Amino acid sequence: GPVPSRARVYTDVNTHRPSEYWDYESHVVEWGNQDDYQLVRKLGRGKYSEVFEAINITNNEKVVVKILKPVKKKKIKREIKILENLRGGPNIITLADIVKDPVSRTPALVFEHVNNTDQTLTDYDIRFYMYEILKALDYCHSMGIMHRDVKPHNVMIDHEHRKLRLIDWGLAEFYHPGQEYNVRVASRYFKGPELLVDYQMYDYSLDMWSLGCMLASMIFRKEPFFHGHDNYDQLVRIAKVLGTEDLYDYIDKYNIELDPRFNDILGRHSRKRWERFVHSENQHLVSPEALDFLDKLLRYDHQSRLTAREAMEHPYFYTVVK
Numbered sequence: 001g002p003v004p005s006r007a008r009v010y011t012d013v014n015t016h017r018p019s020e021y022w023d024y025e026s027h028v029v030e031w032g033n034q035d036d037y038q039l040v041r042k043l044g045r046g047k048y049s050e051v052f053e054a055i056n057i058t059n060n061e062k063v064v065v066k067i068l069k070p071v072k073k074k075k076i077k078r079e080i081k082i083l084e085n086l087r088g089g090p091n092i093i094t095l096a097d098i099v100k101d102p103v104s105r106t107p108a109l110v111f112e113h114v115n116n117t118d119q120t121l122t123d124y125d126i127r128f129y130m131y132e133i134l135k136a137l138d139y140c141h142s143m144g145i146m147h148r149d150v151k152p153h154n155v156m157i158d159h160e161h162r163k164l165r166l167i168d169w170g171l172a173e174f175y176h177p178g179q180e181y182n183v184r185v186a187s188r189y190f191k192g193p194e195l196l197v198d199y200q201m202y203d204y205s206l207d208m209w210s211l212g213c214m215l216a217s218m219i220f221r222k223e224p225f226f227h228g229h230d231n232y233d234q235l236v237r238i239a240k241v242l243g244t245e246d247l248y249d250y251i252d253k254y255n256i257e258l259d260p261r262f263n264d265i266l267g268r269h270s271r272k273r274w275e276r277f278v279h280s281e282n283q284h285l286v287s288p289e290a291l292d293f294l295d296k297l298l299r300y301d302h303q304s305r306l307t308a309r310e311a312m313e314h315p316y317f318y319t320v321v322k
């Protein structure tokens with residue numbers, strides 16, 4: 001069987017908290033009043049959600065309303081409990097209310113309003129915003145929660161106010177050491193190698209891999225950086241950059257049973273130098289410190305990646321106010 005693993009940090013946060021903190025199935029959800037709100041306009045949609053700008057008619061404040069198709073009720077309870085536990089954390093979206101349609105029983109989450117800013121980014125801007133995301137991740141990991149869906153669309157930035165919010169906690173989960181989790185999390189391009197090789201005993205370090213994918217796409221102007229066309233191909237795209245030598249050493253370290261399908265597609269690939277991705281169009285965003293930081297996030301071995309707190313101490317952030 002596979003070798004067990006434990007987070008290097010915040011290992012026992014949930015172990016030392018009462019069950020009311022992490023037992024989301026027992027959480028008593030209390031509805032607010034859907035009549036306090038009026039929908040203004042549709043902002044976007046997902047397979048099981050619709051997002052609207054709305055106004056709270058009792059105080060004239062704008063809000064964002066996420067209407068959920070309740071296909072998996074336990075999942076909605078988990079998102080609500082996590083949002084309540086994390087409320088007030090640095091750069092964590094604030095859940096303002098929870099309402100239900102009086103006839104269809106469709107639930108809706110009400111968030112603080114955020115004016116999302118859709119080439120003008122400087123090296124300094126990337127360092128600044130990357131540090132704000134790290135504050136959010138160090139906070140949620142310190143609270144015993146893995147986000148598990150870190151990606152650009154889940155990072156809202158109001159650039160005029162230099163305001164950042166980490167959103168969509170629908171895939172977030174409580175970290176319990178030794179627990180085996182579902183690997184069918186995160187968006188394809190941001191999935192860590194642990195998910196792709198079906199290593200279930202993962203932890204907060206998954207979010208640090210996803211953060212590394214975002215950094216690579218920003219500094220190299222290549223969106224997404226690892227462009228897989230399915231979950232198997234996703235690992236091949238990673239292997240084409242990090243090389244196959246370090247991938248095979250990772251699988252052996254954790255005694256992972258690698259799917260036989262990888263034999264026909266993985267091949268043999270050299271370790272590429274991060275400098276290979278630098279071009280005239282992206283050189284203004286790359287520096288030795290940026291590449292050193294990227295190299296310390298994008299590691300196959302989940303235990304070897306920087307933690308959010310270690311990442312915050314990297315020289316890449318020496319130019320930002322802590």
Ligand SMILES: NCCc1ccc(Cl)c(Cl)c1
Pocket residue numbers: 034037038039054065067099101108
């Ligand atoms: N009447 C169903 C649509 C809907 C959903 C959520 C809210 Cl908060 C509102 Cl006002 C309206």
Ligand SMILES: NCCc1ccc(Cl)c(Cl)c1
Pocket residue numbers: 043044045051116153154167168
């Ligand atoms: N996973 C949420 C993606 C997302 C982000 C921002 C907006 Cl405004 C919308 Cl509609 C949807």
Ligand SMILES: NCCc1ccc(Cl)c(Cl)c1
Pocket residue numbers: 121125126127129130152153154155156157214218
């Ligand atoms: N939706 C904003 C995505 C994003 C994520 C990280 C950074 Cl550093 C930036 Cl500039 C932008």
Ligand SMILES: NCCc1ccc(Cl)c(Cl)c1
Pocket residue numbers: 043051064066093111112113114167168169
């Ligand atoms: N996707 C769930 C979280 C979420 C989605 C979109 C927006 Cl605009 C906000 Cl505030 C929050």
Ligand SMILES: NCCc1ccc(Cl)c(Cl)c1
Pocket residue numbers: 274275276278283284285286287288
């Ligand atoms: N400091 C970024 C510009 C630059 C110049 C030369 C090289 Cl080889 C690289 Cl990777 C990057």
Ligand SMILES: NCCc1ccc(Cl)c(Cl)c1
Pocket residue numbers: 275276277278279280283
């Ligand atoms: N990575 C391809 C070679 C290369 C390396 C560094 C720079 Cl700055 C350029 Cl333009 C081109």
